[PDB]
Amino acid sequence: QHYSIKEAMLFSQRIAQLSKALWKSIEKDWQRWIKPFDLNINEHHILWIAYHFKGASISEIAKFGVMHVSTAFNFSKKLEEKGLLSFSKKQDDKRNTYIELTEKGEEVLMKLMETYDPTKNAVFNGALPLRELYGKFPEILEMMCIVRNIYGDDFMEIFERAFENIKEDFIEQDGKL
Amino acid sequence: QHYSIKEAMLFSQRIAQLSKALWKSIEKDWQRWIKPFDLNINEHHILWIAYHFKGASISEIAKFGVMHVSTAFNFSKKLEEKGLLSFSKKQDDKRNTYIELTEKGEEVLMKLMETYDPTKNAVFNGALPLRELYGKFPEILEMMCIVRNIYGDDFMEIFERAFENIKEDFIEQDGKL
Amino acid sequence: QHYSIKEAMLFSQRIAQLSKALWKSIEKDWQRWIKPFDLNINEHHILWIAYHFKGASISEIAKFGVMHVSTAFNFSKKLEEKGLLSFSKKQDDKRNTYIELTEKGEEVLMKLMETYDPTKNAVFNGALPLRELYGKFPEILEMMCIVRNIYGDDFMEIFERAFENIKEDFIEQDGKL
Amino acid sequence: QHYSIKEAMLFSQRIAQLSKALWKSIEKDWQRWIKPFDLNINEHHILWIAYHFKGASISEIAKFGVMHVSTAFNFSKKLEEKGLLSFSKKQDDKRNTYIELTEKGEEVLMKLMETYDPTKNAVFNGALPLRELYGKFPEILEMMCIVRNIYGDDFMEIFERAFENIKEDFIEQDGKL
Numbered sequence: 001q002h003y004s005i006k007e008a009m010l011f012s013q014r015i016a017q018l019s020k021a022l023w024k025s026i027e028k029d030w031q032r033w034i035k036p037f038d039l040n041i042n043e044h045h046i047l048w049i050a051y052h053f054k055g056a057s058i059s060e061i062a063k064f065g066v067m068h069v070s071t072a073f074n075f076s077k078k079l080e081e082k083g084l085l086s087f088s089k090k091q092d093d094k095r096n097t098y099i100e101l102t103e104k105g106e107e108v109l110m111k112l113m114e115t116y117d118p119t120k121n122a123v124f125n126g127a128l129p130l131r132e133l134y135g136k137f138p139e140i141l142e143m144m145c146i147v148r149n150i151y152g153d154d155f156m157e158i159f160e161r162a163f164e165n166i167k168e169d170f171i172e173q174d175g176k177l
Numbered sequence: 178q179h180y181s182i183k184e185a186m187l188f189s190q191r192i193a194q195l196s197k198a199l200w201k202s203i204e205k206d207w208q209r210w211i212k213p214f215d216l217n218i219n220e221h222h223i224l225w226i227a228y229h230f231k232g233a234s235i236s237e238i239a240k241f242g243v244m245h246v247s248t249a250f251n252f253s254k255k256l257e258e259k260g261l262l263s264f265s266k267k268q269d270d271k272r273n274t275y276i277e278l279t280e281k282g283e284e285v286l287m288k289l290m291e292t293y294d295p296t297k298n299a300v301f302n303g304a305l306p307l308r309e310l311y312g313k314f315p316e317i318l319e320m321m322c323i324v325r326n327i328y329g330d331d332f333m334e335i336f337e338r339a340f341e342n343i344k345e346d347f348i349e350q351d352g353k354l
Numbered sequence: 355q356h357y358s359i360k361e362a363m364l365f366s367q368r369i370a371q372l373s374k375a376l377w378k379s380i381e382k383d384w385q386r387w388i389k390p391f392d393l394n395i396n397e398h399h400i401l402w403i404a405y406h407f408k409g410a411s412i413s414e415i416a417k418f419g420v421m422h423v424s425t426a427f428n429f430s431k432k433l434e435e436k437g438l439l440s441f442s443k444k445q446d447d448k449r450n451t452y453i454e455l456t457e458k459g460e461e462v463l464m465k466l467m468e469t470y471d472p473t474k475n476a477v478f479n480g481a482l483p484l485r486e487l488y489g490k491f492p493e494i495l496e497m498m499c500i501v502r503n504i505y506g507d508d509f510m511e512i513f514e515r516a517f518e519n520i521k522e523d524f525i526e527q528d529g530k531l
Numbered sequence: 532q533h534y535s536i537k538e539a540m541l542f543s544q545r546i547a548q549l550s551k552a553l554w555k556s557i558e559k560d561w562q563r564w565i566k567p568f569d570l571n572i573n574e575h576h577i578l579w580i581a582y583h584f585k586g587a588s589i590s591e592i593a594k595f596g597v598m599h600v601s602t603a604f605n606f607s608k609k610l611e612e613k614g615l616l617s618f619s620k621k622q623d624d625k626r627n628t629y630i631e632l633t634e635k636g637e638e639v640l641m642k643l644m645e646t647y648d649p650t651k652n653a654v655f656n657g658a659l660p661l662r663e664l665y666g667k668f669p670e671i672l673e674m675m676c677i678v679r680n681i682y683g684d685d686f687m688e689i690f691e692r693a694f695e696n697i698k699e700d701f702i703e704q705d706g707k708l
Contacts, residue, residue, distance in 0.1 A: 516545075
């Protein structure tokens with residue numbers, strides 16, 4: 001207890017609607033960006049996970065991709081067909097299968113990056129006011145706090161991984177390494 | 178411009194991962210709560226929209242339900258089959274079809290409410306630390322600001338609608354009106 | 355431990371400068387507003403404390419006025435001279451002396467209120483951007499959290515007291531009850 | 532307009548009380564830390580400003596010290612008497628007088644640093660809960676936003692100056708360079 005029941009219902013509905021809105025917008029923009037290259041959302045997500053972690057287990061891919069293991073194997077295979085990634089020999093347990101990007105896939109990823117225009121995506125524009133007032137893009141700490149308690153600190157290490165990987169691996173003259 | 182390209186990529190990835198995590202958790206908890214009653218997530222969402230707005234157009238239902246019109250008609254029909262809601266006579270345009278809850282549906286909704294246990298749902302527990310430190314549940318303003326610029330102030334009026342409807346229509350001794 | 359020493363120094367300096375800036379600005383604006391009526395900052399603060407709490411002990415006045423007891427007695431006396439407030443008979447302990455506003459003082463307070471122009475005060479203008487982005491004036495929760503741990507929940511009840519007193523006791527056509 | 536008058540009064544009182552509380556606590560802790568060395572708050576503030584800016588004008592000192600010019604000259608002189616700082620030859624305009632720390636003063640500053648214990652100061656402890664929940668000390672952005680609109684971006688550059696100076700100039704084994 002030490003909270004009202006009402007309060008709980010209000011908060012629940014509030015976040016469920018907010019989170020549905022946000023996921024749906026990001027989903028739509030993202031799908032726009034990547035549909036030229038015939039990639040599902042999951043597939044691009046998987047490709048990035050491989051870039052950032054220097055290859056991964058399916059169980060890694062499903063953890064950081066917030067998908068089920070099944071989907072991670074299925075879409076991983078679909079990508080193998082497209083020559084984007086490679087598979088390890090052991091298929092004992094789908095979970096332990098190890099994935100690693102082919103070179104063609106890495107070029108796909110870099111290309112998609114040069115195709116990137118922020119000003120086309122909704123959520124970016126929705127956040128620009130806040131960037132202007134604060135001088136920096138919104139941190140949305142409360143959200144991160146929540147997802148940490150939900151998903152775990154090792155989960156949460158992907159944010160640090162990707163920050164460092166973007167900063168170090170690439171540089172910009174018009175947008176790419 | 179007046180921001181870095183890098184910055185944009187960091188922010189994009191950050192929010193896309195955060196928002197996927199949040200939507201997936203709420204999705205899983207919600208599905209747990211409502212699966213006894215053989216209801217899709219969309220279907221429950223539609224039923225609430227009808228309760229709050231005293232019936233609605235399909236186009237209303239899709240706006241506030243963040244779904245496509247097609248889905249809103251399809252799942253609305255599935256609910257009509259279940260005797261939960263009623264349909265208007267005009268089917269000229271799916272969009273203008275007017276939906277209104279049957280009594281059986283309203284009982285379903287109230288029942289689901291008495292079935293509600295917050296302590297079972299992840300995101301609730303993830304937010305309790307913040308509730309303790311602040312003395313109130315997290316407001317997540319930055320998120321709301323964003324969704325407002327994205328979706329519109331009339332969209333955003335559902336939060337006020339539902340706050341007032343919960344407060345006024347119901348009272349709690351163990352949880353329900 | 356479980357923090358860096360450096361971190362501690364950074365945070366300390368940061369807040370000490372921020373808090374000096376804020377106090378000095380509010381001090382200057384406030385002094386501008388009240389200098390017509392020949393009132394020190396403390397004296398006006400004391401008068402409000404009496405209005406809100408329906409009279410008070412000196413020890414109350416010093417708690418909520420964040421001043422020393424000595425100052426609270428001295429400036430309280432200066433106000434008695436001005437016919438603004440009245441004193442209880444017991445002077446056994448300065449702390450237990452009970453203060454209550456004269457009518458003249460209450461008129462002074464209401465007058466000062468009609469003299470109030472927000473647009474003249476700095477800190478108000480500094481906060482208007484945030485009010486525009488958020489649709490509401492900044493909550494500055496982190497600050498309140500801090501002051502709560504510092505000063506105590508009974509201290510913190512003055513915010514609720516004054517919110518309710520402003521809302522209920524007064525109404526606005528051009529600014530006053 | 533486009534806000535209520537009431538709202539303005541609420542916000543004003545709220546921040547004025549919060550800011551008085553915070554300044555008074557920091558004032559008391561700070562005075563505790565520095566009273567061994569017979570230093571006013573202003574005097575220590577002035578000494579730090581000189582360290583960070585490699586000497587300064589009085590007008591600089593008053594800007595960043597949020598004091599009047601008069602006080603900045605007076606307390607600067609008192610420090611010259613103590614052999615802490617040195618003066619430029621020109622006294623044409625007090626404002627343009629240039630101050631620079633003597634070596635004795637720098638040792639005083641470093642000493643005070645080794646005397647530093649965070650766990651003694653109130654505001655530090657008031658913020659530790661937030662540090663624990665967030666994993667980092669509170670940013671209090673809203674406050675900084677406000678002070679920026681109030682005081683100016685060049686004013687605000689002292690935060691960056693001191694961050695970099697602390698990080699680079701010193702290192703810690705038990706607390707000092």
